[PDB]
Amino acid sequence: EQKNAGGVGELEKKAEAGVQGELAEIKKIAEKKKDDVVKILIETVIKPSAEVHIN
Amino acid sequence: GNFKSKLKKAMLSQQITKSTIANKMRLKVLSAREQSLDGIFEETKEKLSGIANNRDEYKPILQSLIVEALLKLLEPKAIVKALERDVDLIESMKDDIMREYGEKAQRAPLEEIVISNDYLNKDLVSGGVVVSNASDKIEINNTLEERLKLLSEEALPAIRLELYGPSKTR
Amino acid sequence: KKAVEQGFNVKPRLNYNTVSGVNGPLVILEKVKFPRYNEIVNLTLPDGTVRQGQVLEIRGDRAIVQVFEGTSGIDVKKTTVEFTGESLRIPVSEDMLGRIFDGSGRPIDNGPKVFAEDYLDINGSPINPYARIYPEEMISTGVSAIDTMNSIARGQKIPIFSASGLPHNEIAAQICRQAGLVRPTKDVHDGHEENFSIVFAAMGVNLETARFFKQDFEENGSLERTSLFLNLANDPTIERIITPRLALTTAEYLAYQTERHVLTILTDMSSYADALREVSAAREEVPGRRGYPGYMYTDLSTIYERAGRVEGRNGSITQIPILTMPNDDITHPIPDLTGYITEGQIFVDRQLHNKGIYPPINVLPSLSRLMKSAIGEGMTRKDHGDVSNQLYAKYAIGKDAAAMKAVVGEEALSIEDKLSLEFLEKFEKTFITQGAYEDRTVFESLDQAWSLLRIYPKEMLNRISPKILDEFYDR
Amino acid sequence: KAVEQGFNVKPRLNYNTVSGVNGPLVILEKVKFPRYNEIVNLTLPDGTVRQGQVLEIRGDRAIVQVFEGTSGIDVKKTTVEFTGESLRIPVSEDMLGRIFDGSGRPIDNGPKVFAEDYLDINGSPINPYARIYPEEMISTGVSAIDTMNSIARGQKIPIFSASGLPHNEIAAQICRQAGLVRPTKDVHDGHEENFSIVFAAMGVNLETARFFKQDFEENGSLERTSLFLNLANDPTIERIITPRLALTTAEYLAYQTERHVLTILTDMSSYADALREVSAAREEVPGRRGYPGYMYTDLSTIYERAGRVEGRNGSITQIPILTMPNDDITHPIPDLTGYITEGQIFVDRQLHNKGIYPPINVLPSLSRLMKSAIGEGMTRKDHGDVSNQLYAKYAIGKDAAAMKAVVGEEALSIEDKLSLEFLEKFEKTFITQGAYEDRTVFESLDQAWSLLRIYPKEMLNRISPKILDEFYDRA
Amino acid sequence: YGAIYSVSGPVVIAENMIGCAMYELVKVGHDNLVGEVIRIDGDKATIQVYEETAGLTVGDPVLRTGKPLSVELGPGLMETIYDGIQRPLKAIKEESQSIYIPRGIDTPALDRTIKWQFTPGKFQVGDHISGGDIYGSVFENSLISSHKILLPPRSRGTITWIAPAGEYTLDEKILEVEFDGKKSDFTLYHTWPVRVPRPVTEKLSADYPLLTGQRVLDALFPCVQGGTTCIPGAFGCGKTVISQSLSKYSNSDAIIYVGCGERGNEMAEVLMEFPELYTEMSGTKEPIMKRTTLVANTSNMPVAAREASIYTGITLAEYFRDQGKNVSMIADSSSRWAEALREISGRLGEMPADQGFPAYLGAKLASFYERAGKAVALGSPDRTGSVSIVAAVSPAGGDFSDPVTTATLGITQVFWGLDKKLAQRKHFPSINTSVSYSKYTNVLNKFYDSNYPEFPVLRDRMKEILSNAEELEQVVQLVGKSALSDSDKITLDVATLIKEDFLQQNGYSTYDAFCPIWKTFDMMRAFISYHDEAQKAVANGANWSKLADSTGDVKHAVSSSKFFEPSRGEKEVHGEFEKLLSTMQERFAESTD
Amino acid sequence: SGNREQVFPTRMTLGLMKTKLKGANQGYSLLKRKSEALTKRFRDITKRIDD
């Protein structure tokens, strides 16, 4: 039981390492594409479409 | 034998701890991936409010919003609800809206449109107009905040594709 | 290329403070523009409480909204309802594995909303009859009662019939924690690109039992392969109807787009049928047999046929719906239609449960209609089918000999019946009896079945071919 | 007494505006402020006057169920006069010894009841915080009832019977022999020894009404009974109010004059049929096989107005009689009766065909408040255990007879043969009783002990050892 | 503001009633009749009324109160009797002096004249306080001493003024909280809608058994504190004895008896038995009524009150659970509640399911049952209460084919089904040991492992013996006991002994009126020792026909073990059971040779 | 057609009927095989009587 409890810190360290590894890529992608995404969303919101749903 | 059962229970507890650590890592990775979307949406909303703050740029946008509301509220009398601000903006383009609704719908021009005195909430609505029917009984909430809120959830898969490539054969 | 750029288009979703009245779990709107059949709404109570609902009926300017979690406190002067774009769609993604979801698809763990790859329609589509193939592999559930006998093919729709008080939930949890392909065992740990996933759906599940599912799958490696769904009894019941639809949509996406082997487990189909009854009676609809709606056959067909292997795509869907017999009767509509639609069934027996044996699978009335395809030489092991047949025959002989015990006496039985009583005792005590956390691989299960079938001399093993006896009896 | 407010003339308004008539009810339009349950006097063009309650109001439209039938009703000349209040029976202590029509009109050449007060035929609910349990057993003299299903003063208990069975004879016998096992009056002096019977006859043969009248005359109970006879030839929906008239006059006597009323309802099946006729003419939603869906509440209203109330020295012992249409408890009439009543006496057709009188089957019969009316200081301390043992032995006798029908007699145990012997002697001597016998509960208990002494002490397991070794060897 | 339009049954349609929400209760007519809205159609609001409707006409005004059907929660709830909508019947008698309840009487649901002693809690002026926070305690009874006064769950704000220690009636301001500048006065009580469950910080998994005392229930089919339960409810000792035992010995800090559809005589029986029952909390006989509040809906009461009776009861139970009290709630004749729902549906004309019952019956019973459970109280300091529903269904000719039991089986966790054959043989309690079940048997493993470790395996063995003997009796009724072996005869007679001396409880004698858990466990191990000792003895050459005669003394001893008086204390009676076990083992060893 | 037990028809009676029918079927099988064993022993005994 003590040996099982010995790896609690090691498992937490591995989980934190994996979380940080994923978060690095996530933050990098977000920083790289945030301006483009915001521009696309602003263009979509500011430009409406006029149509009649009868046809 | 009892101690072997206890050791099996201890191994199960160790596996439980490992599984909990793995689940926490996966949840943290998902949280890190999905955190930035809310900030992006908030920045987009602030940018939309700033864009609507400029009357010269907002005038065509506001006119187009009222028109796209009208073409789906196909009635010859309707009421428009706007902010305390720029009510004279809608006032000055009344005939323009009437005629362009008439020619886009291939119908007669709007016979009567009136700005409702029940002005919108300036703190909540950052531009736009909630056009309602003549009886104030059919509402069309076409506001700068409402459109952004509607599009934020809709554009999620496209945003994901922009942020990262695919991983499966569609 | 990914033609998902249409998601940037924004559509005007309207808000209506025009509720004419409230009638049960339904609210009715008079003025809604350009009616189409089904949509999704998010209506707000006068006190600001946001509530969700669906659309039921459509005619000329006719719209009726069936609000989730009831319509308490809804008035006609302050409540407003927001009409979303179209019908319910689940945000689905490859990294959905390892996530726990509510019946509405909103995750209930501490993680965020799933980062969608695409929004998938919940109903599905009709698979072309010109593009179907047979299930031709085996899914090892780790339960020797289901592996050696009642083997589940890779694509087979096989239910688990149980009663109200029996531990069908525990068997479902064990299957989900232990399910996997036989191939990694057969391929000497060389095959790993054939990824395996599980979609677990809980319907009408009790709060304690839902907590048990969540805690158990969290505390094991099952979650990493599992996309999990819960629906509590006090939760809205149309959410209970949505839950299997969400589970099968996720499973279909995974298997037929990511080329994964997905095992789908649906828990308490009886609660789903009760929810069907409630929603069908919500509209002015005449009840059918035993009160259930007359189209329950079609709905269960739609749920169940979202399974099997398909042409082209390398994935598969294996479905194990679990239902409770309301009165321990086959003739009840739910088990009757489930048997009429699925392939075979697995029986969890009340008396076998009372006798203290777990997992209490009753072998005699349970068959797997597609067991032949799961059996083979490269598939599982060579002796599998013959051992299964011999075990079934010996168990039946032991059972009716035990029945005769009280009519003719022990001494009046033949050596067949003596060996059969011994075999039945050892069988129901060691082979069927399996620890809730014990994972017998299929070859281990076959070895146990051989060590237990070695009671009889080779002459008495009639159901097994001599070619197999000369190979496996002597070890 | 503040009844001086009766000196108030309220001019009734007459409606010559009948809109339509169908079945037992008439519809009149253009009614000025109709009251829901107010009765109306409508005069035919012939000139006769008939009464009728208002079933329901709708704007200026009133629906009236004319009690004396719709024969002769027209539209041109029929005028309806609207009495401002609902039905009220003129009630007084002098109506004892008088015979009344189903509408309460006298049919003994006597005058109208010189009313001391007018009572609505519906009554008022009783505060539960002011109720008292009917502890006092009444000795009906019938051994089939006293020993097994003892009735306490203030109990509702029907005589479940059928066509051609002597339910009338059993009711007359109970009326003749009604009396407390331990009367408060010392040697029948100083207190009301004799019950004051209120007998309502509805949808009943002239022969049965004549039999009841003659039996009350012979026993002398006529001078202290009021008969509300609604014969078969009498109007059909006049049976709606006759149990209400009888129960209101019974409530007057028991709760206002402090008498002990033994209310007998001759045929509740006819009342249920009249209710069904009215409901069918009303196009209401049926509840079961054409019966109204509110029949539970109607039967609750009729039956619940019985028992003892706090602060009053009187009580109502209600013994309605109803004929099961097909000898079955499962019919809506007896089913809805038993759901609200506190017991029943089952007159069994098979028992009657065997010549046994009274043909009371004890297995379906029950007295839900017998438990606290017998024992120490009331009846004898062995009564409860003796009744339990007799019921168990009779049930075992029926089971053994069924088995003997199925398998041979030799397959039956010694217990079963003793059960058949006990059942035969039981039905032939203990249940069987002359119509004029009036055996006391102590004689019945002694006979029951003589019956039980067929079995040895060991197999009277359902009675306490104290009672067994105290009473078994008395002989 | 309102006007009646047309009335049929206890359902009233009122016009000019715009703006009224669903389930809002209104005042109908000049007598201010209490009535709840159930359907809205423009201004026409369909109101159901909780009393009589005969002889009415259009025109009576209707005033809307703006509140749902709420219940007054606070000091004075305990030891009182209420109707379906919480009208104090004792106060009704004191204010009316009649055998009839006044029409539309609006006496306060909770006594205002009595002034209680208030001890201010931890919170002071300026402290932020949220819903459910205990800002003071009140001495109500000797059994409910320190009745926690807690802020209403929906309220929140900062304290601007708190009353000092003293005596305050219901009508006295106790606490002033400020939220967004809106100061709101809080008295010693608060209202709360009966439909909405009281919020909970976290629903804990139930972990402690609700000891009922009946040996079959506490042994084979256990019920935990906070768990749900379905009881046969039929005539006999199945329901009344269970209710009395849960009242007197279940170690619940309070009980909320609610009855709907019971006959007036049964209500009268309940209303006087309870005040004369006592409990020994610690060397003191205290009335159960001090730990009891009762809802007394009857059959004469209208359908709306019948429907709302158990909702009021469960809201009271939730309120007392919010103070940390372990509350047991008995809903006798829940099938009558379902019948009230059916009658309301028929009045509304909505299409039902099954045969006649509304389809949402399953959903509503699921919600009502799931309002129970071990829970962490909403406010601070952290507490842990638990409401245990013990609901009684009633057969209507059918045993389990009725929709109410069919839904309950899937909803509830503990089921105690009636055995009709046992009742036909006057065997009490008359529950069925084949169809009844308790899913907490696995949860209670941790409780058993700490006090009675052998309890689960012994219960499993007892169930196995009963099932095996049941199937053997089924196969022997048509054959005869001639061919059965010694093991079969042992199984049959051991199960007969179990049925006649362990499962059977009269419930009235001084012994085994409440069989404690330790006495139940001791007799379980005694009976199992008898069974397996006989089985081992006949595993040798001992003919069991001779063995039964030679060990009749031991059979009588194990049978009469049920006659031990539990009042003697666990120590000496456990010593007696150990002596019995040793005597049994040595006697069987002697008789084997 | 055939015969009936003249019992009033209800679904409770239907349940009693199916349980009685399955009991009758299991008894048929049980006594049929018991008679098979008894006739085997009886043929043994009768040839024993013959010789």
JSON list of C-alpha atoms in Angstrom, two decimals, chain E residues 337-412:
[
{"chain": "E", "resi": 337, "resn": "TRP", "atom": "CA", "xyz": [-52.22, 9.76, -4.39]},
{"chain": "E", "resi": 338, "resn": "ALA", "atom": "CA", "xyz": [-51.92, 8.23, -7.86]},
{"chain": "E", "resi": 339, "resn": "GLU", "atom": "CA", "xyz": [-55.71, 7.88, -7.94]},
{"chain": "E", "resi": 340, "resn": "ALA", "atom": "CA", "xyz": [-55.97, 11.58, -7.10]},
{"chain": "E", "resi": 341, "resn": "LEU", "atom": "CA", "xyz": [-53.68, 12.34, -10.04]},
{"chain": "E", "resi": 342, "resn": "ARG", "atom": "CA", "xyz": [-55.86, 10.13, -12.24]},
{"chain": "E", "resi": 343, "resn": "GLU", "atom": "CA", "xyz": [-59.05, 11.90, -11.16]},
{"chain": "E", "resi": 344, "resn": "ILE", "atom": "CA", "xyz": [-57.47, 15.32, -11.74]},
{"chain": "E", "resi": 345, "resn": "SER", "atom": "CA", "xyz": [-56.36, 14.19, -15.20]},
{"chain": "E", "resi": 346, "resn": "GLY", "atom": "CA", "xyz": [-59.86, 12.94, -15.98]},
{"chain": "E", "resi": 347, "resn": "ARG", "atom": "CA", "xyz": [-61.31, 16.27, -14.87]},
{"chain": "E", "resi": 348, "resn": "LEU", "atom": "CA", "xyz": [-58.85, 18.06, -17.16]},
{"chain": "E", "resi": 349, "resn": "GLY", "atom": "CA", "xyz": [-59.63, 15.62, -19.98]},
{"chain": "E", "resi": 350, "resn": "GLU", "atom": "CA", "xyz": [-55.98, 14.93, -20.79]},
{"chain": "E", "resi": 351, "resn": "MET", "atom": "CA", "xyz": [-55.37, 11.57, -22.42]},
{"chain": "E", "resi": 352, "resn": "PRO", "atom": "CA", "xyz": [-53.90, 9.03, -19.96]},
{"chain": "E", "resi": 353, "resn": "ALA", "atom": "CA", "xyz": [-51.69, 5.99, -20.50]},
{"chain": "E", "resi": 354, "resn": "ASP", "atom": "CA", "xyz": [-51.76, 2.38, -19.26]},
{"chain": "E", "resi": 355, "resn": "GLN", "atom": "CA", "xyz": [-55.36, 1.92, -18.02]},
{"chain": "E", "resi": 356, "resn": "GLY", "atom": "CA", "xyz": [-56.57, 5.35, -16.93]},
{"chain": "E", "resi": 357, "resn": "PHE", "atom": "CA", "xyz": [-53.50, 6.75, -15.34]},
{"chain": "E", "resi": 358, "resn": "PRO", "atom": "CA", "xyz": [-51.55, 9.80, -16.56]},
{"chain": "E", "resi": 359, "resn": "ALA", "atom": "CA", "xyz": [-48.34, 8.99, -18.39]},
{"chain": "E", "resi": 360, "resn": "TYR", "atom": "CA", "xyz": [-46.31, 11.40, -16.24]},
{"chain": "E", "resi": 361, "resn": "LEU", "atom": "CA", "xyz": [-47.06, 9.21, -13.22]},
{"chain": "E", "resi": 362, "resn": "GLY", "atom": "CA", "xyz": [-43.63, 7.63, -13.56]},
{"chain": "E", "resi": 363, "resn": "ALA", "atom": "CA", "xyz": [-41.93, 11.02, -13.78]},
{"chain": "E", "resi": 364, "resn": "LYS", "atom": "CA", "xyz": [-43.77, 12.49, -10.79]},
{"chain": "E", "resi": 365, "resn": "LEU", "atom": "CA", "xyz": [-43.15, 9.49, -8.54]},
{"chain": "E", "resi": 366, "resn": "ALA", "atom": "CA", "xyz": [-39.52, 9.54, -9.70]},
{"chain": "E", "resi": 367, "resn": "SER", "atom": "CA", "xyz": [-39.21, 13.18, -8.66]},
{"chain": "E", "resi": 368, "resn": "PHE", "atom": "CA", "xyz": [-41.02, 12.62, -5.35]},
{"chain": "E", "resi": 369, "resn": "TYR", "atom": "CA", "xyz": [-38.89, 9.60, -4.47]},
{"chain": "E", "resi": 370, "resn": "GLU", "atom": "CA", "xyz": [-35.66, 11.31, -5.56]},
{"chain": "E", "resi": 371, "resn": "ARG", "atom": "CA", "xyz": [-36.42, 14.25, -3.28]},
{"chain": "E", "resi": 372, "resn": "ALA", "atom": "CA", "xyz": [-35.23, 11.79, -0.62]},
{"chain": "E", "resi": 373, "resn": "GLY", "atom": "CA", "xyz": [-31.61, 10.90, 0.04]},
{"chain": "E", "resi": 374, "resn": "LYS", "atom": "CA", "xyz": [-28.70, 11.60, 2.34]},
{"chain": "E", "resi": 375, "resn": "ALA", "atom": "CA", "xyz": [-27.77, 15.21, 1.64]},
{"chain": "E", "resi": 376, "resn": "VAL", "atom": "CA", "xyz": [-25.45, 18.03, 2.64]},
{"chain": "E", "resi": 377, "resn": "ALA", "atom": "CA", "xyz": [-27.44, 21.06, 3.75]},
{"chain": "E", "resi": 378, "resn": "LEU", "atom": "CA", "xyz": [-27.36, 24.12, 1.51]},
{"chain": "E", "resi": 379, "resn": "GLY", "atom": "CA", "xyz": [-26.04, 26.75, 3.91]},
{"chain": "E", "resi": 380, "resn": "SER", "atom": "CA", "xyz": [-23.34, 26.99, 6.56]},
{"chain": "E", "resi": 381, "resn": "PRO", "atom": "CA", "xyz": [-22.16, 25.43, 8.80]},
{"chain": "E", "resi": 382, "resn": "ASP", "atom": "CA", "xyz": [-22.02, 22.21, 6.79]},
{"chain": "E", "resi": 383, "resn": "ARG", "atom": "CA", "xyz": [-24.63, 19.67, 7.88]},
{"chain": "E", "resi": 384, "resn": "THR", "atom": "CA", "xyz": [-25.72, 16.20, 6.77]},
{"chain": "E", "resi": 385, "resn": "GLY", "atom": "CA", "xyz": [-29.41, 15.34, 6.89]},
{"chain": "E", "resi": 386, "resn": "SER", "atom": "CA", "xyz": [-31.31, 12.53, 5.22]},
{"chain": "E", "resi": 387, "resn": "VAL", "atom": "CA", "xyz": [-34.97, 12.05, 4.29]},
{"chain": "E", "resi": 388, "resn": "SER", "atom": "CA", "xyz": [-36.13, 8.43, 4.05]},
{"chain": "E", "resi": 389, "resn": "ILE", "atom": "CA", "xyz": [-39.36, 7.87, 2.13]},
{"chain": "E", "resi": 390, "resn": "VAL", "atom": "CA", "xyz": [-41.33, 4.86, 3.33]},
{"chain": "E", "resi": 391, "resn": "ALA", "atom": "CA", "xyz": [-44.24, 4.91, 0.89]},
{"chain": "E", "resi": 392, "resn": "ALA", "atom": "CA", "xyz": [-47.17, 2.50, 0.95]},
{"chain": "E", "resi": 393, "resn": "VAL", "atom": "CA", "xyz": [-48.79, 1.37, -2.29]},
{"chain": "E", "resi": 394, "resn": "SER", "atom": "CA", "xyz": [-52.08, -0.50, -2.03]},
{"chain": "E", "resi": 395, "resn": "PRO", "atom": "CA", "xyz": [-53.24, -3.39, -4.23]},
{"chain": "E", "resi": 396, "resn": "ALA", "atom": "CA", "xyz": [-56.43, -2.90, -6.24]},
{"chain": "E", "resi": 397, "resn": "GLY", "atom": "CA", "xyz": [-57.10, -6.55, -7.06]},
{"chain": "E", "resi": 398, "resn": "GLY", "atom": "CA", "xyz": [-53.79, -6.76, -8.90]},
{"chain": "E", "resi": 399, "resn": "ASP", "atom": "CA", "xyz": [-50.52, -7.10, -7.01]},
{"chain": "E", "resi": 400, "resn": "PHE", "atom": "CA", "xyz": [-47.93, -5.68, -9.43]},
{"chain": "E", "resi": 401, "resn": "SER", "atom": "CA", "xyz": [-49.78, -5.16, -12.74]},
{"chain": "E", "resi": 402, "resn": "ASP", "atom": "CA", "xyz": [-50.98, -1.75, -11.54]},
{"chain": "E", "resi": 403, "resn": "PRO", "atom": "CA", "xyz": [-49.01, 1.18, -13.02]},
{"chain": "E", "resi": 404, "resn": "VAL", "atom": "CA", "xyz": [-48.07, 2.72, -9.66]},
{"chain": "E", "resi": 405, "resn": "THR", "atom": "CA", "xyz": [-46.15, -0.33, -8.44]},
{"chain": "E", "resi": 406, "resn": "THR", "atom": "CA", "xyz": [-44.69, -0.87, -11.92]},
{"chain": "E", "resi": 407, "resn": "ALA", "atom": "CA", "xyz": [-43.21, 2.63, -11.87]},
{"chain": "E", "resi": 408, "resn": "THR", "atom": "CA", "xyz": [-42.16, 2.38, -8.22]},
{"chain": "E", "resi": 409, "resn": "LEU", "atom": "CA", "xyz": [-40.18, -0.82, -8.83]},
{"chain": "E", "resi": 410, "resn": "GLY", "atom": "CA", "xyz": [-38.01, 0.98, -11.38]},
{"chain": "E", "resi": 411, "resn": "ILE", "atom": "CA", "xyz": [-37.84, 4.12, -9.25]},
{"chain": "E", "resi": 412, "resn": "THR", "atom": "CA", "xyz": [-37.42, 3.01, -5.64]}
]
